[PDB]
Structure formats: structure tokens, C-alpha cells
Design a protein around this ligand. Structure first.
Ligand SMILES: Nc1nc2c(ncn2[C@@H]2O[C@H](COP(=O)(O)OP(=O)(O)NP(=O)(O)O)[C@@H](O)[C@H]2O)c(=O)[nH]1
Ligand SMILES: [Mg+2]
Lengths: 173, 57
């Protein structure tokens, strides 16, 4: 349905999937880390003058079973693939996450996906150069946006940009 | 509805019930055959669990 956009947060443990979701949902941020099992949210928003609902599934970066992960990925319409700019290993992990999304969505030509480099407020701790992350997004044919769940930088942008991709795909079918 | 309990024991009991439903949904969905109705029910159960866990705190 064009009235409901199903977004999945994907990425390694501790990158800020939940922090981005909760900043977008409720305008809150806390530094306390609680690893996620699986959480979900729904919000009414206005996208380009149109009243829509966004559903967000916030996945575990430390997930136990591949079958559980695959069930979540299969149900999504678009994906925020998140890494922390302060953790190179979280950036390299995004390749395998994307592979898993592609495999579960086997017969879809192009999957709505945005690459999100979170924790932009910790520039002094950056381990992932902007050029490296952007070049990877270009190789995947997707956009790269840097966010901070703490300062709100680009948080609304990533959710709304992905919704626009989901909309464009939905209007092509 | 499911968010109506006000005791820690009652909220925990509703969490245990929703997690049971969630596990049963995953068992059904792990066959890999598309089922948008069951996927929608799974997201709803997760929304309820998320709401319950916030009430629990
Ligand atoms: N400075 C800063 N800290 C952030 C940012 N986003 C998240 N954090 C912090 O990083 C930690 C991990 O955040 P969290 O959202 O729980 O990560 P997650 O990806 O959901 N982890 P998991 O997969 O285990 O659920 C928390 O301590 C959180 O406050 C950000 O943009 N800036
Ligand atoms: Mg989380």
C-alpha cells in the first residue's frame, strides 16, 4: 500500500539503529545501551504533502538465529543499512548484511536501500573515511548519508529519503 | 487491549504471551513462502511488545 511504508533498520551491534529510530519517533536520545532483540514502531507523517504511515522494524545487531533475521528482512520494503563512522568493522559488516537482504529478496530487481553512517558527532573518532563509505554506496547504486542520532543531524532525512524510494518502487509495479 | 495491565507481574505475563505468539509466527514464516498477512501480524506483535517493555520500565 502507498499509505504504509515498512522500513527495517539493519546493521551491527551498537551502531545506533535504535537511537536513530527513537530520535525519529520521539525526539529523544539517551546514551544508555540496551541491546535490542526486536522492536517495532509506527508513526503518522506527512510525506510530500501526503498523509502516510511509516512502520519501522528495529532489528538486533547481535541476533541469534539466521531464520529469525531472514523472517524480518523478508518482510521489509526498504532498508536503512547503518554503520558507525567510529567503527570500521561495522562498515565492513554492511556488505554481508546487504548480501543477506539480497538473498531473501531474491526475485526483486532493485531493493530500496540507503547506507547510513551514524555517529557523525564523533568526527574526532572517525575510522571510516567519507570517501570510502561513499564509494561503497556508489558501487551498490545507493545513497550514503551521515547522521547523528544524538544531535538529530540528517535523522529525518534518512527516513524520508527511504520512504521516497519505497514510494517510487511502489508506483512502478 | 494488551497495554491495559498496571502491575509488573501482569505486564510480564502479557509479554510472555506476545513472545509466544511471535515465536509461533516465526515458525510459520521460516518456510520462506510469502505471507503478507502473517508478516503484518508479526510487526503488530512487535509493536505491542515494544510498548509493553516501555511500560515495564
Ligand atoms: N555520540 C553518539 N552516540 C550514539 C549515536 N547513536 C547511538 N549512540 C550510542 O551508541 C550506543 C549504541 O546505540 P544503539 O542505538 O543502542 O545501537 P544499536 O544499533 O541499536 N545496537 P543493537 O543492535 O545491539 O540493538 C548507545 O550508547 C547510544 O547512546 C550517535 O549518533 N552519536
Ligand atoms: Mg538496538
Amino acid at each position: 500500500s502507498l499509505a504504509l511504508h515498512k522500513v527495517i533498520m539493519v546493521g551491527s551491534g551498537g551502531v545506533g539503529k535504535s537511537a536513530l529510530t527513537l530520535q525519529f519517533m520521539y525526539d529523544e536520545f539517551v546514551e544508555d545501551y540496551e541491546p535490542t532483540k526486536a522492536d517495532s514502531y509506527r508513526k503518522k507523517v506527512v510525506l510530500d504533502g501526503e498523509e502516510v504511515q511509516i512502520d519501522i522494524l528495529d532489528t538486533a545487531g547481535l541476533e541469534d538465529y539466521a531464520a529469525i533475521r531472514d523472517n524480518y528482512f523478508r518482510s521489509g520494503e526498504g532498508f536503512l543499512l547503518v554503520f558507525s563512522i567510529t567503527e570500521h568493522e561495522s562498515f565492513t559488516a554492511t556488505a554481508e548484511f546487504r548480501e543477506q537482504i539480497l538473498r531473501v529478496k531474491a526475485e526483486e530487481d532493485k531493493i530500496p536501500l540507503l547506507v547510513v553512517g551514524n555517529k557523525s558527532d564523533l568526527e574526532e573518532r572517525r575510522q571510516v573515511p567519507v570517501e570510502e563509505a561513499r564509494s561503497k554506496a556508489e558501487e551498490w547504486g545507493v545513497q550514503y548519508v551521515e547522521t547523528s542520532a544524538k544531535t538529530r543531524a540528517n535523522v529525518d532525512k534518512v527516513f524520508f529519503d527511504l520512504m521516497r524510494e519505497i514510494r517510487t518502487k511502489k508506483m512502478s509495479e | 487491549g494488551p497495554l491495559g495491565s498496571e502491575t509488573q507481574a501482569g505486564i510480564k505475563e502479557e509479554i510472555r504471551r506476545q513472545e509466544f505468539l511471535l515465536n509461533s509466527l516465526h515458525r510459520d514464516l521460516q518456510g520462506g513462502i510469502k505471507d503478507l498477512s502473517k508478516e503484518s501480524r508479526m510487526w503488530e506483535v512487535l509493536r505491542i511488545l515494544t510498548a509493553l517493555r516501555r511500560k515495564l520500565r
